[PDB]
Structure formats: C-alpha cells, structure tokens
C-alpha cells in the first residue's frame, strides 16, 4: 500500500514541476534591463546607542518611527527614543536566554521569548507608573524563534518543534496550529493586509499560510541549507529569503516560482537578517563577516556596504516613513544610519 | 541651553537609569557559570541532588563563592542552533556511567557525544570536568563479565584497577587541544562532599588565568 502512495506522490510532484516550467517564458533580468542603475549608495552613522553589557539578539521599530525596543543576553529589555539618545524604559527579564522581541502597533505592549519556551506580554501604560507583565503563553514544546502582533488581542509565534501557532491573549489559549514543516522553523513575516503569512525553516523550504482557514497554500524550494530570514515585498505579491549557503533569493506568489538570486564569490559566510526599502528598490542584508550589504532589487548588483561593527550583525530594521536604518550586533552596540 | 524644562527632566531620568544598569553589571561579573551535559542514565541527578520548560537552573554558595548551574537535557531539538549561547561559561561538567558498557552499546554513544562537545569551535579554551560514576556496580559486574565486549584490544586483567585506567585513557585520547585546556578527571564518591571541593579547586585556576590576562602580565 505504501509503495503505491509513494508513486502517487512522485507523480504529483512531476505534474507540479511541469506546470511551473510551462509558465516560465522570460526572466526578470531580460525584462529589467536597459534601465539606469541606482548608482553608488553611501550612508553614515548618525547615532550610537550604548548601555547593553552583552550580545544583542533582536530589535523592532515602533510605528511612529521614533521609538524602538532591543533585547540582549543580559536579562534586560530597553526602549530607546532615537532623536535624543534617551532611555524611556528598562525592563528586567525573568529568564536570561531571550531570542526575539516585538512592538505592538498601538504602542501599548511588548512581547519577548526564548529557551524557556514561553511568550511574555508586557503592559507599558499603567496607573501605578511601572511596567508589569500581563500574560504568559505556555503551549510550545520547543524554543521560541519569532513573534508578531496582529492587534492588541492576537499574536502569532514560531518554535523549534516545527510548528507555528495563533493565540488569543485574553483567554491564553491557542486558536489555530500550523503543522506542515519537518525542520525547525526559524522566522515569520506578516503580509501588509494581515490575511496571510510566510515562514522559513531548517528543512530549506518556505510555506505560505492562511490565517482564517489554517491551511498551507504553497511551498517554495531552492535553497541548499537552513533558511534564517524572510521578508515581504511592499505591495504584498513577493518575498525574499536568506540562508546559510551565502545566498539570497526572490519568490513571486502569482507565478509560484523563483525570480532572482543575490550572491557573490567573495562572500562565503551565512546571512542573518534581510529587509526592503520604502519603494522596494533596495534589499539590505546582514552577514556573519561583520558587515551589511546593499543590493539593487531589480538588478543583481552590489550598491554599497555598511562597515561599522566589530562582531556579527545579528539584527536590522527599516522605519515606516523610510528615513533611517538600524543595525544591532554581538559587540553590544546599536547604530542608526542614513 | 536650547532645551526646555521637560527636556531636562527627561535627561535626568535617563542618567538615573544608566547608573542602575552599571551596578547590575558589576554584580553579575563575579558569578561562576557552569554547564551540565550528559547522556541519559549517567548519574546527573545524583550530582544535582548532592549540590544544593526548556532549561533548569540551580544556584548555591560554597566557601564565599557563588555558583549557577544550567541543565539543557530536555531541549530535544537541533543543538547547533542554540549551542553558541553558552560561549563564555567558566567550565563544563560531563557525566559518564561506568556500569553502562555491557548494555550500539551506550558507551560508544557517550564517547561520540564527548568527542563532539570537546572539539567544538565555540569551546576552544574551556576546561572540562569529567565525572565517572557508579564505581560500585562496575566493580561487581566486571568480575562476571569481561571488558572485551566493549573493547576488543584490551589485554589487561579483568579487575577494577586496570579497567578504570584503560577507560580514563580512552576518554582522554579524544582531546585534540591539549595546550589551551585541561581535562580534570574524577571518580565520583557518593557519600562525601569531595565533589564540590574538586570543582572549587578546578575553577580557582581559571580565575587566576583570567586575572593574569586582565592585568596585562600575560
């Protein structure tokens, strides 16, 4: 019985591959040619944020484009006004081994988690004048790798037990479980309208998920190793990925196949983080060789470098208005660039 | 100063936060951080009992020095993704059970794990404390059954003396970084406080080496 099912699976895979090949007629490179290059891109350090005493793992910008939160190995969460380098809040964490953090769109809450296997929710605005923990989400059986808020009462998480989840913050229960991956899920990215999301895992594949229905609609393959980072394109019809094979790739939803590859022979280390600019003309990636590279999205040219850190570039982010870029590293410093 | 009354109050609050962060860091620097690794059924629980989710943390104070132990047995996920978090520990304690050679066999599993840990890039200058457990049952068992089941080459007498040394040298052969690190090997005694003493003696040398590096003499 099992052999017949295996035969049916392999036949269906050949079908899907044939259909994808039939769609492909011209490449992006041919289409986006004979158009002027962006030219050299140069940016400078505007601010230096000092105060963590260990490795930094995560950062996330607030929706006003002025405030931000950071997480470090020392058990501290810090909120930073970025025009004046002032400290708004410092939060002590119960468990030191933290891997991710998030900022709510309203501005009222923050979340963090890690090797304790729990997601914690912190209320920023109270009548006693101090920050306190509001919720602890305890379902997962592996470590937490990422989290993002949809509103003030729903959050979505990923874990090292190969599963994603959707939560109801008020009741503390899981509403939907996403279970299709075979390796540790490392990263998630939400769509602009919030009806869909994409995830990347250690089995070297990416999946597209439907929030309301709870099902997997599409699977994307092509990398040769662990996918560490994933981000949505601004109109919501494409996404990009970065892996341990020292490459980045672009995938189109409606054509359901790969569009372009970003790599250079000099680079042989992995990629840790990825992001787009306001119009999506530039792609920005952090590396393990202490540097950030800047890429033309439509062409596959290197346009610039951000060479300012003494150890690994763990995290990066771009503001909603499009004004500044933030980078965090394992040397304990956060830099702002423009 | 081109600043307002509220701007000056905000700057004063920020400096009163920087002060507290520096105090907490100074307190944290003195603590001794230990990592605890072993395969299942290796006697870890006896060590944990005698000395004082995804991770379990224990703390105790012995002779004016403060100790924090972390156990990561229950993670059951890919180790490469999280092992780099523990770079910077003072030392690693590895537990092995001597009786588990009859029962591939568990001994080859333990040797594989020890080899993979020891030669890791993250832990190049980290000292390892090796505990060999279950002396008693090893001594009864070895009489009945010879050591050749685990090891074909062994020629020595089937007695405790030669077997313990042969196993010790088998584990010590795996080290390939003899210059930078020392492997401390102990035969665990159940009813004693010798184990804690042994660990304290081993960590004192690490502290001395750190102070020589900081002063600039080394």
């Amino acid at each position, epitope marked *: 019985e099992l052999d017949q099912l295996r035969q049916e699976a392999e036949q269906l895979k050949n079908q899907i591959r044939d259909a994808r090949k039939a769609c492909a007629d011209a490449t992006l490179s041919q289409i986006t040619n004979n158009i002027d290059p962006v030219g050299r891109i140069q940016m400078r350090t505007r601010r230096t944020l000092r105060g963590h005493l260990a490795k930094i793992y995560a950062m996330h910008w607030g929706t006003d484009s002025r*405030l931000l939160v950071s997480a470090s190995q020392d058990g501290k969460l810090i909120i930073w006004d970025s025009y004046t380098t002032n400290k708004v809040h410092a939060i002590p964490l119960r468990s030191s081994w933290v891997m991710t953090c998030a900022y709510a769109p309203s501005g009222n809450y923050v979340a963090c988690g890690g090797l304790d296997n729990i997601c914690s929710i912190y209320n920023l605005k109270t009548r*006693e004048g*101090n920050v306190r923990v509001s919720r602890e989400l305890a379902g997962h059986t592996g470590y937490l790798s990422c989290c993002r808020f949809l509103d003030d009462n729903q959050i979505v998480t990923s874990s090292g037990d190969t599963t994603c989840a959707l939560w109801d913050i008020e009741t503390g229960q899981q509403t939907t479980t996403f279970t299709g991956h075979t390796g540790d899920v490392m990263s998630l990215s939400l769509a602009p309208d919030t009806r869909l999301f994409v995830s990347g895992a250690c089995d070297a594949s990416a999946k597209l998920w439907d929030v309301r229905e709870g099902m997997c609609r599409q699977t994307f393959t092509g990398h040769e190793s662990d996918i560490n980072a994933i981000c949505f394109f601004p109109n919501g019809n494409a996404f990009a990925t970065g892996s341990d094979d020292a490459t980045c790739r672009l995938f189109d939803l409606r054509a359901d196949q790969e569009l372009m590859t970003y790599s250079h022979d000099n680079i042989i280390c992995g990629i840790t983080s990825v992001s787009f600019s306001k119009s999506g003309r530039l792609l920005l990636a952090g590396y393990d060789d202490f540097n950030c590279n800047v890429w033309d999205a439509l062409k596959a040219d290197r346009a610039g470098v951000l060479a300012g850190h003494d150890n690994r570039v763990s995290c990066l982010g771009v503001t909603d208005d499009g004004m500044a870029v933030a980078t965090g590293s394992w040397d304990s410093f956060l830099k702002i660039w423009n | 100063c081109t600043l*307002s*009354a509220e701007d000056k109050a*905000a700057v*004063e*609050r920020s400096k009163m936060i920087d002060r507290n962060l520096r105090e907490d860091g100074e307190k944290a620097a003195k603590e001794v951080k230990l990592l605890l690794l072993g395969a299942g059924e290796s006697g870890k629980n006896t060590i944990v009992k005698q000395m004082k989710t995804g991770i379990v943390e224990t703390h105790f104070t012995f002779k004016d020095l403060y100790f924090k132990m972390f156990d990561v047995g229950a993670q059951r996920s890919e180790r490469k993704k999280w092992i780099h978090c523990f770079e910077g520990v003072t030392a690693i304690i590895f537990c092995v059970a001597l009786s588990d050679y009859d029962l591939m066999n568990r001994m080859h599993a333990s040797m594989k794990l020890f080899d993979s840990i020891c030669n890791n890039k993250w832990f190049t200058e980290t000292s390892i404390i090796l505990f060999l457990n279950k002396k008693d049952l090893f001594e009864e068992k070895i009489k009945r059954s010879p050591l050749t089941i685990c090891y074909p080459e062994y020629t020595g007498s089937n007695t405790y003396e030669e077997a313990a040394a042969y196993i010790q040298c088998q584990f010590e052969d795996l080290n390939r970084r003899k210059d930078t690190k020392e492997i401390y090997t102990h035969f665990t005694c159940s009813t004693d406080t010798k184990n804690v003493q042994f660990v304290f003696d081993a960590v004192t040398d690490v502290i001395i080496k750190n102070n020589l590096k900081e002063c600039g003499l080394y």
Partner: single-chain antibody
Amino acid sequence: VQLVESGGGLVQPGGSRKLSCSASGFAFSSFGMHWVRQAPEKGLEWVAYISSGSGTIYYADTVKGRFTISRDDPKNTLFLQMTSLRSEDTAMYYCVRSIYYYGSSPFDFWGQGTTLTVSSSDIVMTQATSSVPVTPGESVSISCRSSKSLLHSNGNTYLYWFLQRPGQSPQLLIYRMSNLASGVPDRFSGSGSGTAFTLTISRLEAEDVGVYYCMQHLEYPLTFGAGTKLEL
C-alpha cells in the same frame, strides 16, 4: 492612588510649622513632587518643586529663604518646613505628582489639601472673562492668552487646562494644548496659536459647572491665569 496630607491649623505670627503628605498605591520613587496653594478667595499659586532622586529643587521668589522641601522615599513621605510665618500665608495647600519622559502627562493627580490660618521677567497669563451664563445642551468656548509665545523650537506648545468643581480638588483636562487626559469624555477639545488659546465644550452637561484655569510650563516659575467661572 491616594495622597493624604496633614498639618495646618491656627498659627501665631513669627512661628514655624511643618506639613506632611503620605502616598500610597503607586511607585512613589519615580515621581517628582510639587506644592501649590490657594488663598481664601483667590486663584492658584505655585510654591515648590522637588525632582525624582532629589537632584533638583526649585522655590518661588515670594517664599525663598523661609521654606524647605524634603522627601523620604522608604517611608513614602513628603515634607514642607515653614518658618517666620506672615499674614499672607493663610491658604489651602495641595500636593501634586508629576512624571517626565517622552509622551507622559504631568500634573495628573492632586490631593485633598490642608488649611493653614495665620492669626492677626515672568510670563503673564490673562483670562478676560468671568461668570459666563449657560444652559445644559449648548456649546461653549473659553479663551486664554499670554504675554509670550509658548511654542518651542522642538515643536511643542506648553499650555495646560484644569477644572475645579465646587468643593473639590482640581482635575487635569488637557495637557500640552491639544491632548486629552485619561478618563475624560470626548466633548472637550483644545486649540490655539502661538499666543492665543481656546477650550471648546461641544454639549454642556450639569456636572461641568465650576472654574477653569490655564497654566504654562515653558519656564520656572510656573504661572497660573485667573479663573473663569461657569454659572447656571
């Protein structure tokens, strides 16, 4: 969150007395504290400020040299030491908390007050009207002006509105000209220019009767405009 204050009573001239306030229900060490007074039929007058952590202290010129302000953080207590009391010191004294960071609301919680009877280059604020007659269900507008521009180079206008209902301590309504305080209905709105300001009430309700006050926070000393009373 309660602030209870004590001391006061009847004092002879050329005397000394100390007043106290005890705090409960909040993180007292994180807030700066202020003392403010009101004479028997006059308006509000600022007295003194002590910051969080005790680094900064300020006093009014009228009282400087004769008054001392201190805090005890483990006991959660605030103190005011007075000496050489004058006839002009007869008043009701109040305690106010304030916290300062980006996006906060200073002057949000006031205390009940205590009464002392003694036996026997500053920005000016102008409120030009009093005793405006009105009836429930109608809109209203109130205007306050200044002798100097309250707009700063950073981008903020430092103007505040307060309401004192009969028999009660003051309450904050609008901070920094355009923002609405927590727990306050959306009827109220604040708008203004560099030197002229207005407060608008869309539909009046019976509870809205009392006196309205404007304040500036650009510079020290802090200065209060006269009142404006809504009758019925």
